[PDB]
């Protein structure tokens, strides 16, 4: 069997999108393996709960295997031995990241909201039908990319998908779905600082430069005003550990629709250069940004390669 699996540190995106690839390739005779490189957050084990299904195979070597890659381009959130491995596919709404092959494969990459999306059309381009379970985590995982469509990644597609989706598993009331999960994301109250740096963060290769960028949304900012000077403190350990030029944590509050950025770097001037936005003891309001894909990552990389 191929493996279906997403990035590091996956999502909801990565593990619905896993599961429901899988089982389309499955239907068409092309066996597949769902898989994870990382436990899931609480979002996601809320979303699998909601639906009956187990979490899929926890897999980190993939050398000599057939892999599909879902939610990503890039070496630094693929398997560590993917190089090893045969890259069969790519369905993803990211930038072009570095990942490349020896061989011809497929890629179903499109600039919108949600990998599931992507996959939602290929179940439609086989003529599958898509099971009431599966359209359940598909429809949770477009919700949360999409941040209940409130996202700029958000286009039509995404929003037809859900409500075809929604139809199929029989929800009514999906935008309470969407809220649902973005409670459960703001429920943050005594977990570790690392662990909130890490539950949802990438690392990128801008240039030669290692940039990683953790990300997390909540209904109220308010919630981080305790922790706050220990998630400085760690992101601050944590570019050192991984030798990091730069370490960006988003608290990105989905109702304001705007983050606070916490920053440091080996740049004094990283967000004034990025953005035109400068940090002011390591801190960044950035009004109206959302999305880490479209609002923050393209203005960085640019930064670094010029
Ligand atoms: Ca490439
Ligand atoms: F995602
Ligand atoms: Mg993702
Ligand atoms: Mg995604
Ligand atoms: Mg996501
Ligand atoms: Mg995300
Ligand atoms: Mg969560």
Known sequence: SMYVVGHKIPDSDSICGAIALAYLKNQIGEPAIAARLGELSPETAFILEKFGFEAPEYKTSYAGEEVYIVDHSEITQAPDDIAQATIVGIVDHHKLGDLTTSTPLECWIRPVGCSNTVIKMMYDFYQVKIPANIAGIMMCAILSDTVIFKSPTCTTADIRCVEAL?????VEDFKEV??????????????????????????????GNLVGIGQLEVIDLAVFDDIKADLEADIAKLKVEGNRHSVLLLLTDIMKEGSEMLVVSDSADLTERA??????????????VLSRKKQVVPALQDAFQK
């Open 166 to 170: 929604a139809e199929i598993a029989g």
């Open 178 to 207: 969407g809220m649902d999960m973005f409670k459960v994301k703001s429920a943050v109250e005594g977990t570790p600082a690392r662990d909130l740096v890490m539950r949802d963060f990438k690392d990128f290769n801008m240039n």
């Open 275 to 288: 953005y035109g936005k400068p940090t002011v003891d390591g801190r960044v309001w950035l009004d109206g």
